[PDB]
Amino acid sequence: TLTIDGKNKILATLTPTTIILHNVDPTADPTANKVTQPVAIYFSEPDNGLIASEDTVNITVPASATVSHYSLWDANDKCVATGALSKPQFFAEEGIYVISSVSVDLN
């Protein structure tokens, strides 16, 4: 069982840097079903074994596309986290999907 100090020592080295959106579940294969170009994202230093985004990220989605999941990539093009969006969202025309915040837990 890890202590809080070990958890913080751990999370500091994850260093996620970008986010991509998919329409199919990327858990089995994150290289496929990309829908949007990579965008930058920033995180704060760990505390209580938790890291949170420092600001909102505006992602532009092409027309007639759908987004249902996301993924985070390192500074060296490796997928480290995956998850599902609150809703499957269909864009009739080009628009902005707003990422309010995202965090990674070890608790």
Partner 1 sequence: MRLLNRHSFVVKRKVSEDGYYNDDGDWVASQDIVEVNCKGNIQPYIKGSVKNGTQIALPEGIRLTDTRILYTTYKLRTSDDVEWNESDIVMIDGHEYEVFMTMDWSQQLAHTSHYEYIIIRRDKMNAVRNSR
Of 52, 48, 82, nearest to 68 (Cα)?
A: 82
Binding residue (CB under 8 A) for partner 1 from 15, 42, 62, 84: 62
| Residue 63 touching partner 1 (CB under 8 A) | yes
Of 39, 35, 88, 95, nearest to 65 (Cα)?
A: 35
| E strand segments, 1-107 | 18-22, 39-40, 50-52, 57-61, 66-73, 79-90, 95-99, 103-105
| Residue 6 touching partner 1 (CB under 8 A) | no
| Residue 95 touching partner 1 (CB under 8 A) | no
Q: How far is the CB of 92 from partner 1 (least distance, A)?
A: 7
Q: How far is the CB of 36 from partner 1 (least distance, A)?
A: 14
| Residue 40 touching partner 1 (CB under 8 A) | no
Footprint of partner 1 (CB under 8 A): 62-64, 92-94
